[PDB]
Design a protein around this nucleic acid. Structure first.
Ligand code: SF4
Ligand SMILES: [Mg+2]
Ligand SMILES: [Mg+2]
Lengths: 261, 1152, 261, 261
DNA sequence: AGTGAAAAATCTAAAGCATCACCTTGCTGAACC
DNA sequence: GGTTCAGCAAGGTGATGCTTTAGATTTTTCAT
């Protein structure tokens, strides 16, 4: 008997529509600390980490740790049934694999409830180690997602350089080179249009833009995305849905073939 | 019907007097005479009682030529199974319906091949109905067959009613033997086989003919065989016509003596006798006869055939250009070939004389010679088999050679004749007759008929030795119901797994790469002693204690295999192998005890009362099933059936009456029902074609009747017996050539050629079993059997691929065998010095032994048993593992093409080149079909003849780049330097036109547009005789319009210039144009795109997959391959996540 | 000699968009009673009735009963150039074999006449059975379009229940079973978003969601749609457009085999 | 180099968005008069000219008459990176062997460089026959484009005719005959719907409508289309507003002189 | 070096479906009387 | 303190490019 209330039901839509496009199967974990989603790609490259706590979930209780291996190509066809202002109530059973949803209209005119049977699978777990994770930058999610979608046509991979003179997004392609610079306009009282860039060293590291497309699908969750990088480490991306939780998403880079011999 | 009776009577004594003057005098004297059978034809010989009756005449030859013909009476056969317990009154009604039309009706019990509960001795019984003549049989066939079809639905409905309960003419339940011919059924029931020494007993006239086999005389007499070949006059650049052109020369070849008859009306001078000897085993004695006109030439030919009297006549493509031309030239000059040698056209367009087997080597080259397809001409077959080059001559220039000098033209004609005759008697004459000793069919039909009906004739022979009733032809059943409840559209077994895993140039001199996994090598080092032990104890069937020299070949094996461990990655020359049984599939029938009549489902298996667990009665085997069907349910089908009943509907018969539901045939209502469901599920169910692919297990019973199994068993071990006998007589010859015993060496040469031909024919039929099983509609064809055989072939061959991927670089997976390479440091072939006197040397294959242990250890089966002696009730227990993957030997070259999209697999496309440069085999290429363009033929020949140059991949692609650069530079310069007269032949494409312009209706295509242009050329007069296949090119200047409406013929360009100019301006929709020469209206973009697609799919894409730069840099890669290649070679690469992030656990949601 | 006026162009443009999918060939009936169209769909399961009364037109003067047999896809292809504001006029003559119609604008500048030929085929005129409707629901068309496109993704066979509490849609299928309830709206006096229930006895049956989508694609016609059901009759869809006329759908339910049920 | 200043750069991105099907590869010619494109399409039918005058732009800076043969559809996939409110700034270079385009966000915190190596093809220039045409018409491109995309799909060939009372467009097809008439606006001074016709002698021409709505659809660059037309000359289609837009099409009559019969 | 006919691969037109820019509308904030 | 008009977020909607299904055409394969 699990319950999970969410009054602002558009954010569950916005997280779930961002994981169909490059994850086929992810295994939700539930415990007293909240709900987690620690799951790798089926292509075995980049990995998801949802963490949502109980200070945004209104009606919420959970006394046992368990897991459910939900499918992602079929769960994001039954959640857009609610509109952008409906409230969403998840329910679950101890012994049954049936996950139930409740979509309730805010004006009390359309009540729907859903059941979905699930299946058990066998995936891997990749825990994160704690590191410096410097060169942290904060950008608007709309601008970053817009430019990430834009650079997909000119190139297939990106070189990201955190240096003193802003941030360098240089995609590498056969036709031309498209590079993006972010200026430190720190003299703004508004946090939306003012970017924060702090660092310990200039870091140059390269990533797969074809995965950055399916990556950047989580646009309208948080107004500001916070991305951070270091050397020889996967990029970390935080989409902080500050009412309860945050999406950390980790993308492994491309590196050289060490020193040739 | 007296007029037709006297007509066929006159035909009977006409053929009889035709053969009496031709040498085949009848068996009219009372006595006993030996003979050897030559021909088999139906005839209409009567009896002394003047009762109408059909008979059959055999032709018997002697060792000294005192030939004769024996006609014996024989009525045709027919079987009808009726309802049980009431078969007397149906036979009495059948006898009383026709005064004396039926000859005899009788009933004797038999056994059904698929009747359940056969252990208690169940019986099903037919009645035999015999007619006195064949045309009465076909008249009764046409009288009764639609009634049978309609009543079959009634019987089917009754069966459905009976199934629901379980949940006068109309007393007949089914009928068979309407497709077996007269002579064929004749042999099936009497067992009289062509090519066997017989003796005949015939006393008096009232007694019939007695015939008895004399099989101890294993020698065979040489029949007098005349091979002949014409040449005709012709007007240039056109296929010759038989109404105006006439023969300048005939050349023919009778039993080693050659003659040449020439027309002196066109030929300028007489021709003297000459000798032509290409090889010492091919003698060429030749005499010349010269006649003033064609009438005296054909008269000399006819009288010399009447005098020498050849039993077997040999041509090359005789049924196409030869016989219609000579028949028409007889008809022009007031004669006919029916009236002097008896050669007329049959119903199928083939020419079969009543006494002279017309026999055509081109059909054998197409079918059994195993030459590559697209290489079926006589020159190719003579070079492949006889091992010499026939003299070539241009038919365009042969007309001027007919008047300039006749000697070289005569040499060409007699070369054609001697090539045809020696390719006949050295190879295919004892081959055909060795096929004939086992197939009950006359020689012209056993050469003409297909592979499946040859297997059918063998199975009918063994079916009537076993006394079973023949299943009919498997018809197509309309609207088959899936057990799920959906009607079908297509229903298919395993889809012919073909995969070209690599593409590139491969040779025995090229250095290739090997990643060797040492785990399989560690397996092999501890296996190899037992592997060679088992190979010598099973492939040779001798004990290992017999040989003494095991240790030194074992040490050579150890040294080679240990020098293979020393590095995984290595580069040397690979030997090219073909890892398979020649037809694994018959052995897959054998070792699994498979047969098409002993595979059922679980329901009728549980209906049988002798089921028992833990026994051999229930065995199961795996395959995979494919069905494209209709997503509409089953109850809706009853709904739409009810809604399509009792309503008005348009009859198909013009001005017909008001038709109802009951008399509608199944095919018209089937189309209506398909249209109704296609309309119903274009709207409600979102689909109309659902492709379900699943896996199935079938239960194979024990042998109710083992007729399909023991045929293959006896035929395989008789093949091996004949192979051993041929090897024994080959060693006898190999001693006799230095014995010096001329008559004895000639007779043992005859014996070894005979045994070689029996071995070759048995090999061809053993290959033919698979080709018979893989078609639908055969009279013994099982769906599940074909699926099982193809899937187990796939599983065995991918097990072999899984192992051989680590000892080299295997290349091409096929439904016939792995085509792969192996390193040369890997040992290839071992000779054994054996102390046995029966074999001083033993040749054993090392990859063969490896594949033998593969198929032995991988597949152990306990179902094999031997029945030696029923009296002692003994049962030895041993397993049969006779899957002999015979490596055919190291080839010289191997070429693979590639495919035109990202990641699709090719469809049976490769070329294999044998060691002496001869093209060993070719499959799936453009040269297979004589159509398309012959702009591509010369390019493809010049590229496949040019892979045998250079040592490294750089050099071989350099030579291929030279060839492609030459041909694309001829294309790129618009073919300007050479004369343009041959260019109109070279560039244009020729498409046939089958129907008329109005048959397709409103549909318009390229051929329809070309026919419309041809109609606009002259008018409806050309449409009246529009049997000519249309040649065309593609226009260029109207851009935007599709190429389906952009075809212009070359017939406009041969017209007078002013109408050409005006009507070309009418075609091109541009009256302001000024030029008329053929330089710009050619769509060179389409032509260079065609040649570009060829050079992509043959050369450049395999080059990109062989890590080399493009040999044709002016032809760009496709986008997907360019992306993959530019991503691969960049050392900047993608790193995965299992290395950069460690593993923290493995779990599963386990059941509690 | 026939003549008709429309001071609005939305409805006559959108009926052809609403009806082109079910019907390929139709038979109009123009008379003093107005415009009649009874038709079978091409699978002969669903029935359609397009009815236009004479008093709904601005001026509607005709001669006598005329049955005319052009198809419908050509009409929707040619007439959809008109907008939602252009005014409509159609004229005809008995002796002429073609019917003309002008799309005119109130400023008398944008104007377009089209004349259409008459291809002649006469289908059978079957009598529509008229009986009582046991359950009547009057509910908005936008919510009905949302719920039909909602249930299209989950399942194929929708089971619909009419009870005292309201209406209940339910969908089976391999991706779960959905349940949607719509209750009475008694505290809402405005009727452009409320529902209305006329109730005799509880009913429920199974219907095909592809056909429901094919009925519901008529949604711009009216702000409300009247679904109604009785014992074993084809379910009727009433599109009360205006005083102009009606557009009525009839759908037979599917018979479920008792075996294995 | 023409790294000109633009107050708004939506025009270039939409003309590349629309003309991605007309020309498969073009060459940008820039001289002291501005930018002049003259390109002949893939089917070799019309010659399209675009004139963007230098004084229409904010600034001009080039060494001489420079023709850069950049593939037209290749840089169309990258030019929509800029927004409709994005601007193109100014830079000075004299020996640039690689052309770069500058992208500047409206908030002046994001700068981007999109480069393209110099590759060139020589295209033959064609003379343009120019004289005073008989009939020039002017209608807003909205309803003209709307009827051109709603009447090309009933017929392939149109007789276009110009007279004093109203210009007509008549296309026949297998589903009927349609035609469009335009009258004259004299009491209307507003630009949004005025159709002004300057008229000399009535003309008749015949054209294919497939090429007219699909390969020559660049409507929102201007708002009023003007068609220049005369006897025995091809079409002149003009999209024209002020100094910000002037493009034109030259579709030719593909009518033979009765050689079919 | 022929022929004819059927199963399957290939080519082409039309419908499904996710996405993007734009039209219209409800909620709300600051200047005004 | 009521008003009111503009600003802006947001749903509905026409238009669009890619994808998927369906029917006609050639191509291989088998019988001859
Ligand atoms: S397998 Fe079944 S049907 Fe066949 S003999 Fe055994 S019990 Fe009878
Ligand atoms: Mg010949
Ligand atoms: Mg010849």
């Amino acid at each position: 008997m699990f319950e999970a209330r969410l009054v602002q039901g558009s954010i569950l839509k916005k997280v779930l529509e961002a994981l169909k496009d490059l994850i086929n199967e992810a295994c939700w974990d539930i415990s007293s600390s909240g709900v987690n989603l620690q799951s790798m790609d089926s292509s075995h490259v980049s990995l998801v980490q949802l963490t949502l706590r109980s200070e945004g979930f209104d009606t919420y209780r959970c006394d046992r740790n368990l897991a459910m291996g939900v499918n992602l190509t079929s769960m994001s066809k039954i959640l857009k049934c609610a509109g952008n202002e409906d409230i969403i109530t998840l329910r679950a059973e101890d012994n049954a694999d049936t996950l139930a949803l409740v979509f309730e209209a805010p004006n009390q005119e359309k009540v729907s409830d859903y059941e979905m049977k699930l299946m058990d699978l066998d995936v891997e777990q990749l825990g994160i180690p704690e590191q410096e994770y410097s060169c942290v930058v904060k950008m608007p999610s709309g601008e970053f997602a817009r430019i990430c979608r834009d650079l997909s046509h000119i190139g297939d991979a990106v070189v990201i350089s955190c240096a003193k003179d802003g941030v360098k997004f240089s995609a590498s392609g056969e036709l031309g080179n498209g590079n993006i610079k972010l200026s430190q306009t720190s003299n703004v009282d508004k946090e939306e249009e003012a970017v924060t860039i702090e660092m310990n060293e200039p870091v140059q590291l390269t990533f797969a833009l074809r995965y950055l497309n399916f990556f950047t699908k989580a646009t309208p969750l948080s107004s500001t995305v916070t991305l951070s990088m270091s050397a020889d480490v996967p990029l970390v991306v935080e989409y902080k849905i500050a009412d309860m939780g945050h999406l950390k998403y980790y993308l492994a880079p491309k590196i050289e073939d060490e020193e040739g011999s | 019907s007296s007029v037709s009776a006297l007509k066929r009577l006159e035909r009977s004594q006409w053929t009889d007097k035709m053969d009496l003057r031709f040498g085949f005098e009848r068996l009219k004297e009372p006595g006993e005479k030996t003979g050897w059978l030559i021909n088999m034809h139906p005839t209409e010989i009567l009896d002394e009682d003047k009762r109408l009756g059909s008979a059959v005449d055999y032709y018997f030859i002697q060792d000294d030529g005192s030939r004769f013909k024996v006609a014996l009476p024989y009525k045709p056969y027919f079987y009808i199974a009726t309802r049980k317990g009431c078969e007397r009154e149906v036979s009495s009604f059948l006898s009383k319906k026709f005064q004396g039309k039926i000859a005899k009706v009788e009933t004797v019990p038999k056994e059904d091949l698929d009747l359940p509960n056969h252990l208690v001795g169940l019986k099903r019984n037919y009645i035999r109905l015999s007619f006195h003549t064949v045309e009465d049989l076909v008249k009764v066939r046409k009288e009764i067959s639609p009634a049978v079809k309609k009543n079959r639905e009634q019987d089917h409905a009754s069966d459905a009613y009976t199934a629901l309960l379980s949940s006068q003419l109309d007393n007949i339940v089914d009928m068979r033997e309407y497709d077996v011919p007269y002579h064929i059924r004749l042999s099936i029931d009497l067992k009289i086989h062509v090519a066997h020494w017989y003796n005949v007993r015939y006393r008096g006239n009232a007694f019939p003919v007695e015939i008895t086999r004399r099989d101890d005389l294993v020698e065979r007499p040489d029949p007098v065989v005349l091979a002949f070949d014409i040449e005709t006059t012709k007007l240039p650049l056109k296929f010759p016509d038989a109404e105006t052109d006439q023969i300048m020369m005939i050349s023919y070849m009778i039993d080693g003596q050659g003659y040449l008859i020439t027309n002196r009306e066109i030929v300028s001078e007489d021709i003297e006798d000459f000798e032509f000897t290409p090889k010492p085993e091919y003698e060429g004695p030749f005499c010349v006869f010269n006649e003033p006109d064609e009438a005296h030439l054909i008269q000399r030919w006819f009288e010399h055939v009447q005098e020498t009297k050849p039993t077997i006549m040999v041509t090359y493509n005789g049924d196409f250009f030869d016989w219609p031309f000579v028949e028409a030239r007889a008809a022009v000059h007031g004669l006919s070939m029916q009236q002097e040698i008896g050669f007329q056209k049959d119903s199928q367009g083939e020419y079969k004389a009543p006494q002279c087997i017309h026999m055509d080597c081109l059909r054998w080259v197409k079918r059994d010679s195993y030459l590559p397809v697209g290489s079926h001409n006589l020159k190719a077959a003579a070079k492949a088999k006889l091992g010499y080059d026939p003299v070539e001559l241009d038919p365009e220039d042969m007309c001027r050679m007919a008047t300039e000098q006749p000697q070289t033209l005569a040499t060409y004609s007699v070369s054609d004749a001697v090539a045809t005759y020696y390719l006949y008697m050295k190879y295919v004459h004892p081959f055909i007759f060795a096929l004939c000793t086992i197939i009950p069919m006359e020689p012209d039909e056993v050469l003409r008929k297909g592979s499946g009906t040859l297997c059918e004739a063998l199975l009918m022979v063994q079916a009537f030795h076993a006394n079973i009733i023949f299943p009919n032809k498997q018809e197509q059943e309309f609207n088959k119901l899936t057990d799920d409840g959906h009607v079908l559209d297509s229903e298919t077994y395993v889809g012919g797994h073909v995969e070209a895993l690599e593409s590139g140039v491969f040779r025995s001199d090229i250095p290739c790469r090997f990643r060797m996994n040492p785990a399989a090598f560690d397996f092999l080092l501890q296996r190899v002693e037992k592997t060679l032990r088992h190979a010598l104890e099973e492939e040779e069937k001798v004990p290992v204690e017999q040989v003494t020299n095991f240790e030194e070949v074992c040490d050579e094996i150890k040294s080679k295999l240990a020098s293979l461990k020393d590095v995984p990655s290595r580069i040397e020359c690979p030997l090219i192998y073909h890892l398979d049984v020649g037809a694994m599939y018959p052995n897959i029938i054998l070792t699994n005890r498979l047969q098409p009549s002993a595979m059922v489902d679980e329901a009728t298996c549980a209906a049988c009362d002798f089921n028992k667990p833990g026994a051999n009665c229930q065995r199961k085997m795996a395959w995979q099933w494919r069905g494209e069907f209709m997503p509409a349910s089953r109850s809706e089908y009853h709904r739409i059936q009810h809604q399509l009943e009792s309503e008005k509907f348009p009859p198909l018969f013009p001005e017909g009456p008001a038709r109802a539901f009951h008399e509608l045939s199944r095919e018209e209502q089937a189309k209506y029902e398909k249209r109704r469901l296609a309309d119903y599920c274009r709207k409600a169910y979102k689909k109309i074609h659902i492709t379900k692919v699943e896996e199935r297990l079938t239960t194979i019973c024990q042998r109710e009747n083992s007729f399909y199994v023991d045929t293959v068993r006896a035929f395989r071990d008789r093949r091996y017996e004949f192979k051993g006998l041929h090897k024994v007589w080959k060693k006898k010859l190999s001693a006799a050539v230095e014995v010096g015993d001329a008559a004895e060496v000639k007779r043992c040469k005859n014996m070894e050629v005979l045994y070689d031909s029996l071995q070759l024919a048995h090999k061809c039929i053993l290959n033919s079993f698979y080709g018979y099983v893989m078609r639908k509609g055969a009279r013994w064809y099982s769906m599940e059997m074909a699926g099982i055989v193809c899937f187990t072939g796939a599983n065995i061959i991918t097990q072999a691929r899984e192992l051989i991927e680590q000892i080299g670089r295997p290349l091409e997976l096929d439904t016939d065998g792995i085509w792969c390479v192996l390193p040369n440091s890997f040992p290839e072939n071992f000779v054994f010095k054996t102390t046995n006197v029966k074999k001083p040397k033993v040749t054993i294959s090392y990859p063969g032994a490896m594949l033998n242990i593969m198929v032995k250890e991988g597949f152990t089966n306990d179902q094999y048993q031997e029945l030696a002696e029923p009296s002692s009730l003994t049962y030895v227990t041993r397993s049969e593992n006779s899957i002999f993957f015979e490596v055919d030997g190291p080839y010289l070259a191997m070429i693979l093409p590639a495919s035109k999209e990202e990641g699709k697999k090719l469809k049976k496309r490769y070329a294999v080149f044998n060691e002496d440069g001869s093209l060993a085999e070719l499959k799936g290429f453009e040269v297979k079909r004589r159509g398309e363009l012959q702009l591509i033929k010369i390019f493809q020949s010049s590229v496949f003849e040019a892979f045998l140059k250079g040592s490294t991949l750089e050099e071989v692609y350099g030579s291929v780049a030279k060839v492609a650069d030459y041909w694309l530079d001829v294309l790129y310069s618009k073919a300007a330097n050479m004369p343009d007269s041959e260019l109109f032949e070279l560039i244009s494409e020729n498409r046939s036109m089958s129907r008329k312009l109005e048959d397709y209706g409103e549909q318009k295509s390229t051929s329809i547009s070309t026919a419309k242009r041809l109609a606009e050329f002259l008018g409806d007069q050309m449409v009246k005789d529009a049997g000519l296949s249309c040649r065309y090119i593609i226009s260029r200047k109207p851009e935007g319009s599709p190429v389906t409406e952009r075809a212009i013929p070359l017939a406009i360009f041969q017209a007078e210039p002013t109408v050409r100019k005006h009507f070309l301006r009418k075609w091109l929709k541009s009256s302001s144009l000024q030029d008329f020469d053929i330089r710009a209206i050619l769509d060179w973009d389409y032509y260079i795109e065609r040649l570009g697609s060829a050079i992509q799919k043959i050369i450049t894409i395999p080059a990109a997959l062989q890590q080399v730069k493009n040999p044709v840099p002016r032809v760009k890669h496709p986008d997907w391959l360019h992306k993959k290649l530019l991503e691969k070679n960049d050392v900047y690469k993608q790193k995965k996540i299992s290395e950069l992030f460690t593993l923290e656990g493995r779990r599963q949601v386990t059941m509690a």
